[PDB]
Amino acid sequence: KVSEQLKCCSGILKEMFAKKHAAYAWPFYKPVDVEALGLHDYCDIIKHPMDMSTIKSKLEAREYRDAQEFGADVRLMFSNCYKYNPPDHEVVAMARKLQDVFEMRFAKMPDE
Ligand SMILES: COc1cc2c(cc1-c1c(C)noc1C)[nH]c1nc(C)nc(Nc3nn(C)c4ccccc34)c12
Numbered sequence: 001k002v003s004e005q006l007k008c009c010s011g012i013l014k015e016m017f018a019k020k021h022a023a024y025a026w027p028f029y030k031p032v033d034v035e036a037l038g039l040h041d042y043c044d045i046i047k048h049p050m051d052m053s054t055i056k057s058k059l060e061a062r063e064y065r066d067a068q069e070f071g072a073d074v075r076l077m078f079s080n081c082y083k084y085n086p087p088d089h090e091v092v093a094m095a096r097k098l099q100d101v102f103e104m105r106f107a108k109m110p111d112e
Contacts, residue, residue, distance in 0.1 A: 004110040012105050019109040024094040028052050050077040
């Protein structure tokens with residue numbers, strides 16, 4: 001069950017990095033560069049930053065013991081975006097599209 005779940009998590013993350021989703025996934029590929037973007041309040045608002053490259057590194061290091069932990073990091077990444085940005089910001093629309101890609105496939109997780 002666990003090995004199958006982690007292959008599903010790796011598949012989902014590989015799809016989230018695929019060129020077909022790149023037009024809305026790209027802001028989530030790497031840690032938010034607070035200095036480059038001039039987001040001087042980011043670290044005051046977001047206590048636990050998360051991004052797709054960090055999630056990839058954790059899967060490669062076998063840090064996630066099951067799908068629930070992996071899913072919690074993916075949702076943390078989207079939640080930080082929803083917390084920091086105004087609700088009508090273009091990046092929030094991109095986050096909702098990438099989260100729909102993730103949730104529809106994560107719902108198909110092997111359950112035995
Ligand atoms: C404005 O939220 C971001 C911009 C970026 C970003 C990350 C974020 C971000 C925040 C904050 N909260 O969640 C995420 C995700 N990474 C970027 N890398 C580069 C090279 N340029 C960017 N520029 C963008 N500036 N604006 C206003 C955007 C709107 C739409 C798309 C990207 C830009 C971003």
